[PDB]
Amino acid sequence: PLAKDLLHPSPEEEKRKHKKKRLVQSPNSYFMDVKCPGCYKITTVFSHAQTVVLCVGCSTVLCQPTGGKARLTEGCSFRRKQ
Amino acid sequence: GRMHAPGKGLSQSALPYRRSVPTWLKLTSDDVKEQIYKLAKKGLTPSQIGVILRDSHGVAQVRFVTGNKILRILKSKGLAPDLPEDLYHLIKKAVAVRKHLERNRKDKDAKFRLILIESRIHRLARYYKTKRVLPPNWKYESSTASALV
Amino acid sequence: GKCRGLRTARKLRSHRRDQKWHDKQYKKAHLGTALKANPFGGASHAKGIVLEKVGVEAKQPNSAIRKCVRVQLIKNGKKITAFVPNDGCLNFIEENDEVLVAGFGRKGHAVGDIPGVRFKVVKVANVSLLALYKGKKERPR
Amino acid sequence: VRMNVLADALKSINNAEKRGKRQVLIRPCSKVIVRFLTVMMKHGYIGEFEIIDDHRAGKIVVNLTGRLNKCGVISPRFDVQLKDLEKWQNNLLPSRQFGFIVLTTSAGIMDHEEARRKHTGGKILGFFF
RNA sequence: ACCCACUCCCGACCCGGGGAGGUAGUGACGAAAAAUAACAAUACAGGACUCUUUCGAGGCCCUGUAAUUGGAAUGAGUCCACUUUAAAUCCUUUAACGAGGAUCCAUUGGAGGGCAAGUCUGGUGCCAGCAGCCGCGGUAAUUCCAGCUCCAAUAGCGUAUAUUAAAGUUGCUGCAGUUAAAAAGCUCGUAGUUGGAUCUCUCUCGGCCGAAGCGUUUACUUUGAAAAAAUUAGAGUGUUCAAAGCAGGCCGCCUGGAUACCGCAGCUAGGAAUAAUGGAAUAGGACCGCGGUUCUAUUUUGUUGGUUUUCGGAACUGAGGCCAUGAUUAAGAGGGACGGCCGGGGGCAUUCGUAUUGCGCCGCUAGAGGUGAAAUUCUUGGACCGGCGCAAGACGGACCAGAGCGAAAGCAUUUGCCAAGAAUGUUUUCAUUAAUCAAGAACGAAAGUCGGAGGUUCGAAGACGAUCAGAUACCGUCGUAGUUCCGACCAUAAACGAUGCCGACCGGCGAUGCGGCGGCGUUAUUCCCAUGACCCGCCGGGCAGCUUCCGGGAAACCAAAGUCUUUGGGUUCCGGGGGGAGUAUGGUUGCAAAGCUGAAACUUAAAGGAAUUGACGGAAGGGCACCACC
Numbered sequence A: 001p002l003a004k005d006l007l008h009p010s011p012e013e014e015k016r017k018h019k020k021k022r023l024v025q026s027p028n029s030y031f032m033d034v035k036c037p038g039c040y041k042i043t044t045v046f047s048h049a050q051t052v053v054l055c056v057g058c059s060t061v062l063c064q065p066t067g068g069k070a071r072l073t074e075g076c077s078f079r080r081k082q
Numbered sequence B: 001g002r003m004h005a006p007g008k009g010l011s012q013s014a015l016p017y018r019r020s021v022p023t024w025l026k027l028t029s030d031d032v033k034e035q036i037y038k039l040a041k042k043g044l045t046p047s048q049i050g051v052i053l054r055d056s057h058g059v060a061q062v063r064f065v066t067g068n069k070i071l072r073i074l075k076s077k078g079l080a081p082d083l084p085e086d087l088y089h090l091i092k093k094a095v096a097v098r099k100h101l102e103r104n105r106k107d108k109d110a111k112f113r114l115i116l117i118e119s120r121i122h123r124l125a126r127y128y129k130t131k132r133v134l135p136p137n138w139k140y141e142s143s144t145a146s147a148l149v
Numbered sequence C: 001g002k003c004r005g006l007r008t009a010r011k012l013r014s015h016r017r018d019q020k021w022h023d024k025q026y027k028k029a030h031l032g033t034a035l036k037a038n039p040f041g042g043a044s045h046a047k048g049i050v051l052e053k054v055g056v057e058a059k060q061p062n063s064a065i066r067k068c069v070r071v072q073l074i075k076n077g078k079k080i081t082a083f084v085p086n087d088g089c090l091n092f093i094e095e096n097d098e099v100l101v102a103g104f105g106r107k108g109h110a111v112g113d114i115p116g117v118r119f120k121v122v123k124v125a126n127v128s129l130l131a132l133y134k135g136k137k138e139r140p141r
Numbered sequence D: 001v002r003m004n005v006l007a008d009a010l011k012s013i014n015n016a017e018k019r020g021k022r023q024v025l026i027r028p029c030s031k032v033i034v035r036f037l038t039v040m041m042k043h044g045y046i047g048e049f050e051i052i053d054d055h056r057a058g059k060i061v062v063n064l065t066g067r068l069n070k071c072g073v074i075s076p077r078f079d080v081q082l083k084d085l086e087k088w089q090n091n092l093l094p095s096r097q098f099g100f101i102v103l104t105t106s107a108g109i110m111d112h113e114e115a116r117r118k119h120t121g122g123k124i125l126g127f128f129f
Numbered sequence E: 001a002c003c004c005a006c007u008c009c010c011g012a013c014c015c016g017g018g019g020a021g022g023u024a025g026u027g028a029c030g031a032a033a034a035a036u037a038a039c040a041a042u043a044c045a046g047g048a049c050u051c052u053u054u055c056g057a058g059g060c061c062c063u064g065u066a067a068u069u070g071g072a073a074u075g076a077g078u079c080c081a082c083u084u085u086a087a088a089u090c091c092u093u094u095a096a097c098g099a100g101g102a103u104c105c106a107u108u109g110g111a112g113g114g115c116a117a118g119u120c121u122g123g124u125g126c127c128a129g130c131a132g133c134c135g136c137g138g139u140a141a142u143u144c145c146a147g148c149u150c151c152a153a154u155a156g157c158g159u160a161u162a163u164u165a166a167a168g169u170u171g172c173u174g175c176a177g178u179u180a181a182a183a184a185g186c187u188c189g190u191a192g193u194u195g196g197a198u199c200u201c202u203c204u205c206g207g208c209c210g211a212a213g214c215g216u217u218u219a220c221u222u223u224g225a226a227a228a229a230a231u232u233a234g235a236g237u238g239u240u241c242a243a244a245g246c247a248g249g250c251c252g253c254c255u256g257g258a259u260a261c262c263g264c265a266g267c268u269a270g271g272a273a274u275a276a277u278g279g280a281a282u283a284g285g286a287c288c289g290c291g292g293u294u295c296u297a298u299u300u301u302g303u304u305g306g307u308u309u310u311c312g313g314a315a316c317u318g319a320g321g322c323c324a325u326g327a328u329u330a331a332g333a334g335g336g337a338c339g340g341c342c343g344g345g346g347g348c349a350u351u352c353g354u355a356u357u358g359c360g361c362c363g364c365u366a367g368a369g370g371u372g373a374a375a376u377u378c379u380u381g382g383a384c385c386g387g388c389g390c391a392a393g394a395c396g397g398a399c400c401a402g403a404g405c406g407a408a409a410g411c412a413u414u415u416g417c418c419a420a421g422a423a424u425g426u427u428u429u430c431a432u433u434a435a436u437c438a439a440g441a442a443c444g445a446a447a448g449u450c451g452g453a454g455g456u457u458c459g460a461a462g463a464c465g466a467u468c469a470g471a472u473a474c475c476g477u478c479g480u481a482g483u484u485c486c487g488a489c490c491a492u493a494a495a496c497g498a499u500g501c502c503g504a505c506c507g508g509c510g511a512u513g514c515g516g517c518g519g520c521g522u523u524a525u526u527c528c529c530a531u532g533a534c535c536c537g538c539c540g541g542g543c544a545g546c547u548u549c550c551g552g553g554a555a556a557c558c559a560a561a562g563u564c565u566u567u568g569g570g571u572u573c574c575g576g577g578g579g580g581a582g583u584a585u586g587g588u589u590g591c592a593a594a595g596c597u598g599a600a601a602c603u604u605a606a607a608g609g610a611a612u613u614g615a616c617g618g619a620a621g622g623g624c625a626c627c628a629c630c
């Protein structure tokens, strides 16, 4: 305590903190590139998706809504964007 | 804290610092606008439009891409709700609780919650009157509440 | 807490006067019942006619007989018990004689031993009790 | 709800100084807050501070030197004329040798001595010593 | 009472009149000045100062019994004369007289504390009395009645009453509400109060200025003007000083009769931080030019005359160009969406569980019940007990926790339906929509009141039996209203965290409930990802707990009851010594019971809160003794 630099927070404890309580608020979510097991072409998906994302180029269900992060279908791969 | 509940929760979205469109986003402002228009024709409120665009089409903030908010976009072209969506949802909730109450006369929690919902409706309606969104003679009536929704 | 805004003057003033009514002295002075009930009628002194000499028991911790007189005020006819201060001074007072009475010292409240007595005799037959007590003047005939 | 952000900032810095901490973070920030912190700067009571630009409202990280006894706000922001300034500083300041009353006049935000020099009254904001 | 002499007024008026006014009289309302002695010599209690060795000396300086001396100085009085004045009086000026107890004699209140000054003497003896308060007095009274002495103010000083300060005990500055008096039972809600970031003067007229607008309007701040005198502050000025007055000063002159202040509102001109308010989002936009539509004032023009245009002015306007054409941010503010959950939250229906009571049958039966002991009470017209069934109502044990839910009262068998809800998640949406709340509303334990239905258990009242000196009680038997459901009233609780709500900051630690985010490794499984059950952390909102020299507090204690004389984040209610009294009265609500609002007379020096020692206890633990026991 006492002499603790609030100007230069450490990255680990900055991620440790709540998203709204950081020096500058940074959301915890991200955008994923989801690849279906059979379809050759990728889809952009929100991590905390609240809707049943359907394959635009097929009938496969890509993710299911949950309390927090959306659950990807088994086999459907994903890569973090940016 | 909550307006009508004792709870004091801290749960909301945290928009990022960067207001620039991400490079991977290949959608143009016009494409986003047409997607918004057809989603509105499907019968969705601006909230649902934003959720669908964020979930499936990979746009973070429509205002961030098109330089303009969703409701303004809908009102600009013409197809916008007669009364604001939050007021509409409040009226719908009040109608539902009233319908439940008229048959369950013994329910006293429902009466209390209904009064809370009416207070919220009145506050919102008075605010919208002061901003000229609603006509000054617009008033909430239980008899015509179901008609409005 | 109290209101502190720039436009709260009326609230502060109204609250202050309403709460002022809860003060014992302020209510006594401004309600008007105390002045009506006061036998002197707000005067410092009064004049009365001696009705009878009476002896009042002192309060319990000390035993004594306080020599007082029943007087009838001229200005309103109210009857009062007044204390005759010094010793032998009761012998200076007769029946049906003019007496000038003052307060006892605490604003209509009983003083010391004597119970329910708030007046003391100052003059008897237009001559001061102190002058009679000290032999400076004698009782008129 | 939160009103008068200046009061919250001054309370935060006062509590941090009572606790002996070397830096304090204040949020939300404001131009009134920055001007008050700068008049506290020029008299050596606070030290260097830095503004963090969150796109909603900035934060201020304030370095603290142990020279600050009290800093507070006066609400409501009463209008002060030149005649009554003496009474105000007699009430608020601990001495005539040190301490400052801060006020907004049309000339800006400044301590009572500068307001006397410029012959301008205004509205009282707070005090520090 | 005297007078129009002064200040002024009236009249026809230089002339008359004026109880206006002036002058005296009374006058301790109150304010200013100011006597009641000073000195010298002695003699000393004497003292300091001084040398000496103690005396002494030290005769320098001071004080006092000085009923010791001594002359000096005076005005209080008496009183000529002036002076004063309209006439006088007073004061001032001056003759004469006028002081040793200088008797030419200071009083009013006190002497335990508060509060300055006698536990000296005599008298009284809880009497008389004193004493604002605490108290003093019952035979040695520091308190009464007196003598002596002493002290406070002093030509004044006591007393009663109003009022101010003391009173931060009305609190704007600046008080309090856990336990001392105090936060509404809970929530909603109009008015009120308060409210998050954000935005760095010119075109025309007249002689470069003077003019004109208008920059949205202000509030605020500074200036200027206008604002009776007296009073207040204050400059000058020796009234002999002073309170006063506005006078006065120099050898005819010289010089005053200032200045400040005067809320608020109303005028005035600068400043533009702060704080409100507006300016384009049906473009009911700005600027340039255009074009139109209409009406109209005058140019025409030595003149006349003639004359409709032109020009000028407007309103109504339609196409254009141009604006970088016009929307700040999305609050660790707030609504509203959306997702997976979660919970004794609520309503309707349904279902189950024993138990209790009663009934039918069967068995053996003489007791069974109750209590400290009994009795009242049911019993061979089978009581109690055991077994098999039936019914009626009530209630949901153990699981059940310093766990959960609800605004609070309150909420626990299964299942279904119905509408709700917090938290968490969120790069959704609106965009200030908010906080607290007179008026006005919803809910509100139990008891109680009107109707129905039902009435198992328990049970106010009541009838008995016990106990007791007595028992209208505590214990026991029976038992009405009630207890249960529905529909209307009632709106009160120690409705309690005896602690308003919203927001910020200020220490640690381990748990726990819900949601989300990670991570080895065990389990359902036997293999697949799962998803559940554990385990190790993180975040957020909760019920709490321990700890701490955060800091507070009278302390108990409180991480809020902290961030308070270093006193101001917003806002509601509400207290002001104890009783009378939540009483009387009026109003209002209610069928009623009662609820809400709510005094005064009068009485009283304490009542009260925390904490410390003892004493006590029919509270719990130990220990000891043949004046205990074994």
Ligand SMILES: [Mg+2]
Binding pocket: B003, B004
């Ligand atoms: Mg609210």
Ligand SMILES: [Mg+2]
Binding pocket: E004
């Ligand atoms: Mg005359």
Ligand SMILES: [Mg+2]
Binding pocket: none
């Ligand atoms: Mg005359």
Ligand SMILES: [Mg+2]
Binding pocket: none
């Ligand atoms: Mg007269």
Ligand SMILES: [Mg+2]
Binding pocket: E025
């Ligand atoms: Mg005379």
Ligand SMILES: [Mg+2]
Binding pocket: none
């Ligand atoms: Mg007098």
Ligand SMILES: [Mg+2]
Binding pocket: none
């Ligand atoms: Mg005097």
Ligand SMILES: [Mg+2]
Binding pocket: none
């Ligand atoms: Mg004389």
Ligand SMILES: [Mg+2]
Binding pocket: none
């Ligand atoms: Mg004396």
Ligand SMILES: [Mg+2]
Binding pocket: none
């Ligand atoms: Mg004496």
Ligand SMILES: [Mg+2]
Binding pocket: E115
């Ligand atoms: Mg005394």
Ligand SMILES: [Mg+2]
Binding pocket: E116
């Ligand atoms: Mg003394």
Ligand SMILES: [Mg+2]
Binding pocket: none
């Ligand atoms: Mg006295």
Ligand SMILES: [Mg+2]
Binding pocket: E112, E143
């Ligand atoms: Mg005494």
Ligand SMILES: [Mg+2]
Binding pocket: none
């Ligand atoms: Mg007073």
Ligand SMILES: [Mg+2]
Binding pocket: none
């Ligand atoms: Mg004071």
